[PDB]
RNA sequence: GGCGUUGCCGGUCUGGCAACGCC
RNA sequence: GGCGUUGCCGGUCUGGCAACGCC
């Protein structure tokens, strides 16, 4: 059924929730909320509930919480970036989205938007946490919607057996120098797992 | 022979087109004549040659006697320079930046330099940080071989071994990984053979 | 408190401990 | 011609090819 919504008022849930994303967010200002992995296993751990995750998206669809892909944030918390940041943040998303399965380099970004290593290592360290970007290297970060896409198309190569390096370059129609990193990436997270000189899908 | 004349004439040509590189690399001055020629003997060729001083023999190439590349009088005392940090520092090499920094210099014309070396062999490449001296990169190798005669061995007994820190010898044993010295078992290596 | 750099440690990661810079 | 950079290639660099910069 999914659930929509229930009836025991223990909205002590709901008090102790606030409770915990005020505390962090007044610790932590310049990150983009508490990990849901992490209220997960604090508020909601022991009780075996798979409506946690419908629980959130109700309470995203009252206003009440701001759902990122993997951080929570209670309804008007904003993190206090300076404006120029708060600009910079969604034009780095939008350049990340954009160019997919070719993402630009950390160095490229930096001179692009005239930033400093520093800066731009704190602006997308914050999308990293936020679940919009996913770190594959020093070099390359990938938008989170491309990455899942190239997941999917590695996934259904693996499906007739091992593949090689260009066989996975062919099927995403990239390069090595985008190619390789990736790989590298999903062996670290355990998407994939090297057999020979090859990769299968794992987990 | 013959033989050094079809040398000195493939020097002499490697020489004018490459009058910034080191010299030809042995392997290919072998490959190209002397390749049903064996291993052994095609080294007392080189050797012999060189004690007549007519071969300048490094790690890895040869260059005709009276070669000098011809780098500026900057840039060659550079090399000498870059080549004695290296050494000095030894298993604890300067990091690619470090260098560009101290020497005021270019990334690219840093890069010319450390390549020229890299391809005498006077230098190993690391990775993209750290480059290493030759005797070094011997050495640790050597203490390698100690260490994994008594059996499998850790990160941290081999920076034990070396006097290091965790930063340099990480680096230095995936190298050794990638040219199969070392082979990498869970978290302990042994010296392949 | 936070954000970052560096060093050392522990196989390894936005990991532990410490210096420092910044807010 | 070379040296470097970037791109692409072959699991990889003591590379190959191409464009660009410099000589």
């Excluded at 946690?52 to 904003?78: D, I, K």
């Excluded at 692009?112 to 360290?125: G, K, T, V, Y």
């Excluded at 091992?162 to 129609?173: I, K, S, V, W």
Aim: hydrophobic share 40%; aromatic share 12%; no cysteine.
């Amino acid at each position: 059924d999914l659930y929509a919504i229930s009836t025991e008022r223990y909205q002590a849930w709901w008090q102790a929730v606030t409770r915990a994303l005020e505390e962090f967010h007044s610790r932590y200002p310049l990150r983009p909320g508490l990990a849901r992995e992490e209220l997960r296993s604090r508020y909601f751990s022991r009780l075996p509930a798979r409506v946690y995750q419908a629980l959130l998206e109700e309470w995203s669809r009252e206003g009440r919480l701001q759902l990122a892909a993997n951080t929570v944030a209670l309804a008007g918390f904003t993190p206090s970036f300076s404006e120029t940041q708060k600009k910079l943040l969604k034009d780095l998303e939008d350049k990340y989205r954009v160019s997919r399965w070719q993402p630009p380099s950390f160095k490229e970004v930096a001179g692009s938007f005239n930033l400093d290593p520093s800066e731009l290592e704190e602006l997308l360290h914050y999308l990293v946490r936020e679940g919009v970007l996913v770190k594959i290297n020093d070099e390359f970060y990938w938008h989170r919607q491309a990455l899942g896409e190239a997941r999917e198309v590695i996934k259904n190569l693996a499906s007739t057996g091992p593949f090689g390096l260009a066989e996975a370059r062919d099927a995403l129609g990239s390069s090595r120098k985008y190619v390789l990193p990736l790989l590298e990436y999903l062996d670290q997270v355990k998407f994939t797992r090297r057999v020979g000189d090859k990769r299968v899908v794992v987990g």
